[PDB]
């Protein structure tokens with residue numbers, strides 16, 4: 229896989245962000261995770277966590293997987309990095325997302341994320357508390 233440039237336009241919630249990619253605004257849905265909706269338990273903390281990560285970053289990057297690059301809603305499907313740290317993984321490591329939506333062909337980072345989830349759960353963090 230390859231990292232490509234993007235710039236933040238706006239934080240949305242725990243697992244969606246609006247980025248400018250190839251000069252066009254698009255909403256990205258983070259691969260292989262599910263955050264709670266803002267209205268649900270840990271939803272606000274997930275949203276805040278992603279927001280801080282993306283807003284504090286000097287360099288945002290998009291990494292597409294091998295599969296589908298857009299979903300049925302028009303959202304970009306990619307892993308998102310903030311100064312080299314994957315947001316998708318970080319949310320899972322902190323117990324603020326579950327590994328989820330694992331589809332054939334877009335699952336390169338599955339086992340990385342599962343390992344993070346196991347550690348969050350062992351620590352009883354947030355969702356796992």
Ligand SMILES: Cc1cn([C@H]2C[C@H](OP(=O)(O)O)[C@@H](COP(=O)(O)O)O2)c(=O)[nH]c1=O
Pocket residue numbers: 257258259260261262299300305329331334
């Ligand atoms: C993360 C992800 C979501 N989706 C679709 C499946 C779900 O459809 P439904 O809307 O029909 O439930 C929805 C979940 O996204 P959200 O968790 O953002 O709601 O987005 C994909 O198709 N591919 C993906 O990789």
Ligand SMILES: [Ca+2]
Pocket residue numbers: 243262263264265
């Ligand atoms: Ca969600």
